[PDB]
Structure 1
């Protein structure tokens, strides 16, 4: 068969021998089907790249809409395998309208059933907006639109495998299992640099926290890189992770990392996936020539996302959480389920020397020039004696517990396990 054969692609994605067409095969450029993905009933449609390059027409779209109606009624996940130049120019507005009805089915399914898009060939026009309306997009390299794609696979068959694993993360979420959690505990603090000033890649820490025998499905890895988000499993339970990555921009929030984080929070809240929020944030950055508009609009959306969130969400402060960004990274004010901190963590408005410079500016300015840098250094010292660390914040109430890093998984798992499935 041709590699682009739709029934070939539906068969590679589904469990062997499980495919069951939902309509007679034809020249419409779409084939839809019921199958299983590791036992889960799944609906899937494939565009037929062999007919008119997969251009969508009235009858192809009517198959997709029917497949959505089938999947909405079964409460089944629906997977779309995409390879299409867009709408069929010759069918005119009728095809435009039918493509519109595809979007309207995707909007109806939104947050109801999970929707995965596996993009395996050229995808343009209505065939780029289609996937943009689903929850997760997997793109085979065989296919400039930054932020739109979530997971880049190695190739067409690797794309079907990540797509299969997404189905299992969304419809086979599991229970937290306190006993596996403690079997996996390690000293995650060891992965930190000995200098609090040195930068590091936070992904090893995300990898330490999550189960050893399961991949970490990082979303949008190359877009907004000061922020890491993705799905994984924590003691067998599907969890969503969000983590400032101090290797990029010093781990600060900005307009794009706020958007990446906020869209992910909303996605997990929609399907009941609890969140682990690993925090190491020194502040936030503006735009390209100093425009705060994006970080204000996008940062508000991030607040809104955590604010309205209703799944368990637990925060772990590894090193430092400063100022306005402290609030946005799932803080107590915004109803975080629990807030943990590693023993050496700092919860402050800014650095101690930066904060003394402002708080005692008049004092500092009145002092002789041959004693300022000496008084500033010492003023900063008594400042950290009363502020800065976990002990201050524990007393205020914004950190619930100082935890030994060797017990991060247990503490996180236990905190997640006693929240309700909803309300926060």
Structure 2
């Protein structure tokens, strides 16, 4: 039921399991197999022996599995179900667990590491998955966990799909991009003032027949990140979500976006950045909790990034959030805008209030409103994205939204694999 061989067999392609060592009561079993054709290493802790508690010989098989995966550059998948370290083994067990961590650290950014957590998971079984790239959790067991599966079988499914996304990247296909084009703009609400869930726009850009594997959907909900396929090719998507916190960036969403960029960058996965963000969320909590540093992590992640990364401005992009959301100044591949997009320091009404403050305060009370409006409409006419933005080359092209999918695909495909 919790039998490590059953669990490994459910994970791996049907005929494919080869054990990496003799079965024993060490509390782990490691095997090679294939995942939809890809040689993959996996290990399962043994829920049947001491609740899966981790000891010296078990950790050794994990470290051995990592050495093999690293040597053959295969992805490596951990299946968890463990309540902590074998206490009776004392410091030897701590050391052996530290050795699993060191192997994960050696693997980091080099081979994909996916954790599928299927039982109660504590100690080494909490930190170990936290050193991996993706964590899939099954009900029987922030932003630590990326994907919540429906049940144990569905977790293997999502785990399997993740191997395919990292290891079977695929190729951009101009034909498939175009045949999947639609007027994505029709997905926005009628008023520019209404909030909306960005997720349908994401899934309308990405291939119709493919799941979008959103990461950490309930952590930092003003930011949506995850992996999917664009004309068959694995891409990472980052999109502000106006439904939550007005779509604003904040400490959590900056950290979520920044980790996800680093991940895609490490594995050569191009990025689609869907922007509609009015700024960072003001707040005492934000300043005091170090948003400045967090925001700096997102600037740094995009600025260092070398995979192709294309921005699509759907509605707004303002201020420091505009800079952070894969702007040209950060060395962005291409920046596209829908026809009614705006790129500005802030909204025209707020801008006018500052720029013409004294003149507004000098008008009588009863004319102040009409004047404020006239000034804001003029300020719109002057700049009002994306006109000024096009003129200085920080937006490359204003596009027909019907061609969003193909335009994005074309820009990512034309890009070098590594800037």
TM bucket (normalised to shorter chain) is over 0.9
Matched residue of 2:191: which SS? coil
Partners of 1:151 and 1:14 in 2: CA distance: 19
Matched residue of 1:311: which SS? coil
Partner of 2:180: 184
- Alpha-carbon offset, residue 389 of structure 1: 2.2
Partners of 1:156 and 1:294 in 2: CA distance: 38
Partners of 1:104 and 1:65 in 2: CA distance: 9
Partner of 1:298: 294
| 1:64–1:102 CA contact under 8 A, matched in 2 | yes
More moved, 285-294 vs 351-360: 285-294
Partners of 1:224 and 1:317 in 2: CA distance: 21
User: How do 1:12-411 and structure 2 match up within 5 A?
Assistant: 12-143=10-141, 146-286=142-282, 289=285, 291-411=287-407
Structure 1 49/296 Cα, relative in aligned 2: closer, same or farther at 3 Å?
same
Partners of 1:370 and 1:30 in 2: CA distance: 77
- Alpha-carbon offset, residue 286 of structure 1: 4.2
Partners of 1:288 and 1:208 in 2: CA distance: 37
Partners of 1:89 and 1:345 in 2: CA distance: 60
Unaligned runs of 5+ in 2: none
TM-score normalised over the length of structure 2 = 0.99
Partners of 1:361 and 1:88 in 2: CA distance: 68
Aligned residues: CA RMSD = 0.9
Partners of 2:338 and 2:155 in 1: CA distance: 38
| 1:287–1:294 CA contact under 8 A, matched in 2 | no
- What whole-Å deviation, never above 9, does each CA across 1:328-384 have from its counterpart, x for those lacking one? 000000001000000000111111110000001122222222322222111111111
| 2:250–2:286 CA contact under 8 A, matched in 1 | no
More moved, 392-401 vs 114-123: 392-401
- Alpha-carbon offset, residue 289 of structure 1: 3.9
Partners of 1:256 and 1:286 in 2: CA distance: 13
Partners of 2:233 and 2:106 in 1: CA distance: 27
- Alpha-carbon offset, residue 86 of structure 1: 1.1
Structure 1 388/161 Cα, relative in aligned 2: closer, same or farther at 3 Å?
same
Partners of 2:39 and 2:386 in 1: CA distance: 48
Partners of 2:287 and 2:267 in 1: CA distance: 35
| 1:14–1:35 CA contact under 8 A, matched in 2 | yes
- Alpha-carbon offset, residue 287 of structure 1: 5.1
| 1:312–1:421 CA contact under 8 A, matched in 2 | yes
| 1:255–1:287 CA contact under 8 A, matched in 2 | no
Partners of 1:287 and 1:96 in 2: CA distance: 42
Structure 1 279/290 Cα, relative in aligned 2: closer, same or farther at 3 Å?
closer
More moved, 284-293 vs 193-202: 284-293
- Alpha-carbon offset, residue 18 of structure 1: 0.5
TM-score normalised over the length of structure 1 = 0.98
Matched residue of 1:263: which SS? helix
| 2:214–2:225 CA contact under 8 A, matched in 1 | yes
Partners of 2:303 and 2:285 in 1: CA distance: 30
- What whole-Å deviation, never above 9, does each CA across 1:64-86 have from its counterpart, x for those lacking one? 00000000000001000000011
Structure 1 91/287 Cα, relative in aligned 2: closer, same or farther at 3 Å?
farther
Partners of 1:48 and 1:170 in 2: CA distance: 27
Partners of 2:110 and 2:241 in 1: CA distance: 32
Matched residue of 1:290: which SS? helix
| Residues matched between the structures, number | 419
Matched residue of 1:291: which SS? helix
- What whole-Å deviation, never above 9, does each CA across 1:257-313 have from its counterpart, x for those lacking one? 000000000000000000000000011114564535431111000000000000000
Partners of 2:98 and 2:283 in 1: CA distance: 35
Partners of 1:249 and 1:383 in 2: CA distance: 27
| 2:81–2:119 CA contact under 8 A, matched in 1 | yes
Partners of 2:210 and 2:175 in 1: CA distance: 17
More moved, 256-265 vs 289-298: 289-298
| 2:40–2:75 CA contact under 8 A, matched in 1 | yes
Unaligned runs of 5+ in 1: none
| 1:279–1:320 CA contact under 8 A, matched in 2 | yes
| 1:286–1:292 CA contact under 8 A, matched in 2 | no
Structure 1 196/8 Cα, relative in aligned 2: closer, same or farther at 3 Å?
same
- Alpha-carbon offset, residue 122 of structure 1: 0.5
- What whole-Å deviation, never above 9, does each CA across 1:195-241 have from its counterpart, x for those lacking one? 00011000000010000000000000000000000000000000000
- What whole-Å deviation, never above 9, does each CA across 1:102-145 have from its counterpart, x for those lacking one? 000000000000000000000001110000000000000111xx
